[PDB]
Amino acid sequence: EFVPPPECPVFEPSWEEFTDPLSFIGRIRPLAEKTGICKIRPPKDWQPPFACEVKSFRFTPRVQRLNELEAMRPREAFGFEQAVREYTLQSFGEMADNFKSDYFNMPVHMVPTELVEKEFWRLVSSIEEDVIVEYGADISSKDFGSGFPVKDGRRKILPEEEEYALSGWNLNNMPVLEQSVLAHINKVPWLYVGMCFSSFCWHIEDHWSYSINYLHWGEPKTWYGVPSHAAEQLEEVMRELAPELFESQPDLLHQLVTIMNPNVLMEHGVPVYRTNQCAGEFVVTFPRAYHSGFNQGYNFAEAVNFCT
Ligand SMILES: O=C(O)c1ccnc(-c2cc(C(=O)NCCc3ccccc3)ccn2)c1
Ligand SMILES: [Mn+2]
């Protein structure tokens, strides 16, 4: 069965250390850049409100067939497996919890994170069992607002919430403008509504950017990360073992389907670290750190690429 990778570093900054995000990330870099990803737990009293327009939040999530790569005799009428379904935040959550409790035959919060992890990777490689889930991925914060409070006058902010609108850890306040000559001659966060087994495959960011990720609420998001010094190693294992039909594809397209069991990478000598990102915790990915992961259950994440 699946062997969990070693845990990535988790930091619990003091209030003093928590004042400036870029200063903090710069200070932890000697360790975190060697693990690709790290987790940051804010002080216990730092609790931003959830500021999305919940009443109107509607979306059509993308369908994810866990074993689509292993599955590569064409099945009758491929391309039409799943009927389309639009959800509200509430109705997606009802669907997500029902899916998970039915799947495991127990209440959603009683399913061990290790079991969802072992079962996810079993399902990804299984040809006997076709599990299909849905992911409310890549929803712009412009559509219904950020999960963080923002002083743009579109939504009421209470006095005790203003510090969160102004915080450097509010993802809308991270720096995003890359320096360049073109910048002198001539981005917002994205939202992710997850359910059990919804997932993201191995990738790095455009321009080898840092990214930062905040789980507003819900069940954990499980991460795997590879340090940048091993990026070429991972890419070589992909070349060797990924489907030949996709071998010649540019990285930007190949990354849409680069699913790989972390143990395969580990057996080929690639260092992999894991973490369960819980509600109220940040994950930071360092430049050219490959990462992938899946959601343990119904949850809500916000993410943005930032520059140093
Ligand atoms: O899902 C997450 O929590 C997550 C975590 C870390 N990074 C990403 C991420 C996604 C994209 C992206 O646009 N993907 C295409 C759309 C997409 C397809 C399946 C799953 C999630 C997105 C680019 C860069 N990073 C997503
Ligand atoms: Mn990413």
From Swiss-Prot:
Binding-site residues, Fe cation: 203, 205, 291
Source organism, top-level taxon: Eukaryota
Pathology noted in the entry: A chromosomal aberration involving KDM5A has been found in M5 type acute myeloid leukemia. Translocation t(11;12)(p15;p13) with NUP98. Chromosomal aberrations involving KDM5A have been found in M7 type childhood acute myeloid leukemia. Translocation t(11;12)(p15;p13) with NUP98.
Similarity comment text for this entry: Belongs to the JARID1 histone demethylase family.
Record remark: domains: The GSGFP motif is required for the interaction with SUZ12. The ARID domain specifically binds to the CCGCCC motif and is required for the lysine-specific histone demethylase activity. The PHD-type 3 zinc finger is required for the interaction with histone H3 di- and trimethylated at 'Lys-4'.
Quaternary structure (record): Interacts with SUZ12; the interaction is direct. Interacts with the viral protein-binding domain of RB1. Interacts with ESR1, MYC, MYCN and LMO2. Interacts with HDAC1; this interaction impairs histone deacetylation by HDAC1. Interacts with BMAL1 and CLOCK. Interacts (via PHD-type 1 zinc finger) with histone H3 unmodified at 'Lys-4' and (via PHD-type 3 zinc finger) with histone H3 di- and trimethylated at 'Lys-4'.
Protein name per UniProt: Lysine-specific demethylase 5A
Organism encoding this protein: Homo sapiens
Span of the entire protein shown here: 12 to 588 of 1690
